[PDB]
Amino acid sequence: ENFMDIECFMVLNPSQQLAIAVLSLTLGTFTVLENLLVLCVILHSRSLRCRPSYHFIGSLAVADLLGSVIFVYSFIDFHVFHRKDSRNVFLFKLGGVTASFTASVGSLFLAAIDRYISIHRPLAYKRIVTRPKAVVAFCLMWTIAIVIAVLPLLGWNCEKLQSVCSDIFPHIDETYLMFWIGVTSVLLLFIVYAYMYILWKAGIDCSFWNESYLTGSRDERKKSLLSKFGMDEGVTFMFIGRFDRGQKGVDVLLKAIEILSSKKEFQEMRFIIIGKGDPELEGWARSLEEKHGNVKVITEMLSREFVRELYGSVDFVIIPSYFEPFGLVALEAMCLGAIPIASAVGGLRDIITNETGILVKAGDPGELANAILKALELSRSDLSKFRENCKKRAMSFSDQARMDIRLAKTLVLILVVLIICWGPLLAIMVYDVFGKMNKLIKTVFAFCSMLCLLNSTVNPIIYALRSKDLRHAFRSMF
Ligand SMILES: C[C@H](NC(=O)C(C)(C)Oc1ccc(C(F)(F)F)cn1)[C@@H](Cc1ccc(Cl)cc1)c1cccc(C#N)c1
């Protein structure tokens, strides 16, 4: 019942032991060293240590140290001095490794929130994820992890319970594992949805959402567009988005157009409503079209390059959202000098300032209907400054997001590697508890074990490869 006995898992040559013993210490010590080094680096760096976005690195590196140091201690403690492990020492050793894995998952979860918020709320992030808060998140996350890991030492082992002990690990209760694997498994799933959501929905293409693809005068482009829809020249508001309830507020906008409809000012305005969803709001929106010929609806799926021609041409872009994950429409629109009239939600709060657009109360056709009116009076002066102000700000945001989406991808990589190393092993462990174990499989377990250590090796290296800032902070020493 000794920890890290490869021998209950397979019989070895003296050669293979020799080989393994050498790959083990040399790798183990190596992996201990580089993860120390990672720590000694971020802790000497003012920049790194107490920046929230890089807090997971410090957390992974104690996570990788915890397991690697326990690998190498346990190995020495067994194979060199031949001390043998009591229940509680064994359990403390295993508690060390689970704790490390939990904390790894803990760190990617807390990082994944850090990334969402950094892109969801680019300004407000800096006051939402603050240094003291960041630390308290990590401490809690670590104490939970440590707490879950010590449970077997307080009696949730199979010994103090007398319940079926696992085939795989001595001194431990099988369904305690299931708890521990399940917590971590589901939490992995949410971390993956999370990162995926961020990566499919976040940011824009600054190579494509760019004024420079358009030739001419805005006026000329506007007039040409407007005649393509057989309307005369007139202030042109665009909506593009899902037709739906309580999400992208085309229902709010269709209310606002009926408010204005009677006004004299309305005949001065032009509405281009683009999108699809509810058959009802389409029915409604189509009726407003056949009612007024200064309204124009498009459910026909539209060319992205045309949507850029639109952003390039219309005066205002109307974003009546109840919810806006990453404010893409706004950012694209403004990049091309469309001034945004938008609900004051998510990042729209951070993005639109008083010198770049108009904000309203979500859900309110009256606050919108007036916005539009203020926007039609605003358009009696010149809007060049506004569209210019819009362009840069959006650029700034677009870039910041490109940075923060990069740090996100690093963490996806770190995740993918982490699922890869540990994925097989937990599958096997679940497989072990449930069902029946083999004696081949028992070996590919022991083999897969080492990928736990391997993961701890490669994490420091991709920090190194993937973040200049880590790299530069390390050169600050020598
Ligand atoms: C490599 C360890 N595997 C084993 O102890 C078993 C499963 C007996 O197989 C082996 C396989 C190889 C070795 C050897 F000789 F290379 F060190 C020792 N044991 C594994 C055991 C393990 C325990 C708990 C979890 Cl959740 C995962 C793996 C472990 C031990 C200590 C630190 C880390 C890390 N990072 C990983």
**Three-state SS string across 21-60, please?**
HHHHHHHHHHHHHHHHHHHHHHHHCHHHHCCHHHHHHHHH
Distance in angstroms (rounded) separating the CA atoms of residues 405 and 288: 40
In order of 80, 152, 201, 406, 440, the CA distances from 12 in angstroms are: 17, 31, 51, 45, 14
If residue 133 lies in a helix (H) or strand (E), which one and from where to where?
helix 131-150
User: Resolution in A, one decimal?
Assistant: 2.6
Nearest partner of 363 among 239, 249, 281, judged by Cα:
249
In order of 139, 195, 227, 269, 435, the CA distances from 9 in angstroms are: 36, 36, 78, 77, 18
Distance in angstroms (rounded) separating the CA atoms of residues 164 and 172: 9
For the CA of 17, the nearest atom of ligand 1? 15
Q: Is the CB of 421 under 6 A from ligand 1?
A: no
Distance in angstroms (rounded) separating the CA atoms of residues 425 and 169: 13
Residue 459 amino acid letter: N
Q: At what angle do helices 14-44 and 55-79 cross, to 10 degrees?
A: 150
Residue ID of nearest Cα to ligand 1 atom 11: 446
Q: With beta carbons less than 8 A apart as the criterion, state whether 294 and 318 touch.
A: no
Residue ID of nearest Cα to ligand 1 atom 35: 453
For the CA of 21, the nearest atom of ligand 1? 15
Of 2, 3, 4, 89, best ligand 1 pocket probe by most atoms within 8 Å of the beta carbon: 4
Residue ID of nearest Cα to ligand 1 atom 5: 4
Q: Is the CB of 67 under 6 A from ligand 1?
A: yes
Which contacts (CB < 8 Å, 24+ apart) does range 347-354 have? 347/119, 347/120, 347/121, 347/122, 348/319, 348/321, 348/324, 349/121, 349/123, 349/124, 350/121, 350/122, 350/123, 350/124, 351/122, 351/327, 351/393, 351/394, 351/397, 353/393
Identify the DSSP state of 467. Answer: -
Q: Is the CB of 9 under 6 A from ligand 1?
A: yes
Cα(184) to centroid(ligand 1), Å: 19
Distance in angstroms (rounded) separating the CA atoms of residues 191 and 247: 24
Q: Please give the sequence-ordered ranges of beta strands (E in DSSP) within 207-249, or none if there are none.
A: 235-240
SS3 state at 316: strand
Q: With beta carbons less than 8 A apart as the criterion, state whether 312 and 336 touch.
A: yes
Q: Is the CB of 107 under 6 A from ligand 1?
A: no
Q: Is the CB of 65 under 6 A from ligand 1?
A: no
Cα(3) to centroid(ligand 1), Å: 8
For the chain, what is the total number of helices (H) and then of strands (E)?
18, 6
Nearest partner of 336 among 221, 205, 206, 209, judged by Cα:
209
Residue ID of nearest Cα to ligand 1 atom 13: 6
Distance in angstroms (rounded) separating the CA atoms of residues 249 and 241: 9
Q: Is the CB of 25 under 6 A from ligand 1?
A: no
Cα(73) to centroid(ligand 1), Å: 12
The backbone torsions φ and ψ at residue 68, rounded to the nearest 5 degrees and listed phi first, read -65, -45
Nearest partner of 63 among 471, 473, 422, 448, judged by Cα:
422
Based on C-alpha coordinates, what's the Rg of the chain? 29
Residue ID of nearest Cα to ligand 1 atom 25: 97
Cα(449) to centroid(ligand 1), Å: 5
Beta-carbon contacts of 321 under 8 Å, excluding residues fewer than 6 positions away, are 241, 247, 248, 249, 342, 343, 345, 346, 348, 362
The backbone torsions φ and ψ at residue 313, rounded to the nearest 5 degrees and listed phi first, read -115, -30
Query: Which position has the token pair 């326990």?
Result: 70
Q: Is the CB of 444 under 6 A from ligand 1?
A: no
SS3 state at 439: coil
For the CA of 455, the nearest atom of ligand 1? 35
Cα(453) to centroid(ligand 1), Å: 8
Q: Is the CB of 243 under 6 A from ligand 1?
A: no
For the CA of 24, the nearest atom of ligand 1? 16
Nearest partner of 461 among 402, 397, 408, 417, judged by Cα:
417
Nearest partner of 222 among 212, 205, 237, 206, judged by Cα:
237
Both tokens of residue 375? 């926007």
Both tokens of residue 270? 């032009």
Residue ID of nearest Cα to ligand 1 atom 32: 71
Cα(90) to centroid(ligand 1), Å: 12
Both tokens of residue 196? 């995926």
Q: In what order do the strands lie in the sheet with 339-343?
A: 295-298, 269-274, 235-240, 316-319, 339-343, 358-360
Cα(70) to centroid(ligand 1), Å: 10
Q: With beta carbons less than 8 A apart as the criterion, state whether 202 and 405 touch.
A: yes
Distance in angstroms (rounded) separating the CA atoms of residues 434 and 237: 61
Q: Is the CB of 101 under 6 A from ligand 1?
A: yes
Query: Which position has the token pair 């990566």?
Result: 199
Of 452, 453, 454, 455, best ligand 1 pocket probe by most atoms within 8 Å of the beta carbon: 452
Both tokens of residue 172? 């431990």
Cα(9) to centroid(ligand 1), Å: 11
Both tokens of residue 118? 């950094």
Distance in angstroms (rounded) separating the CA atoms of residues 221 and 287: 27
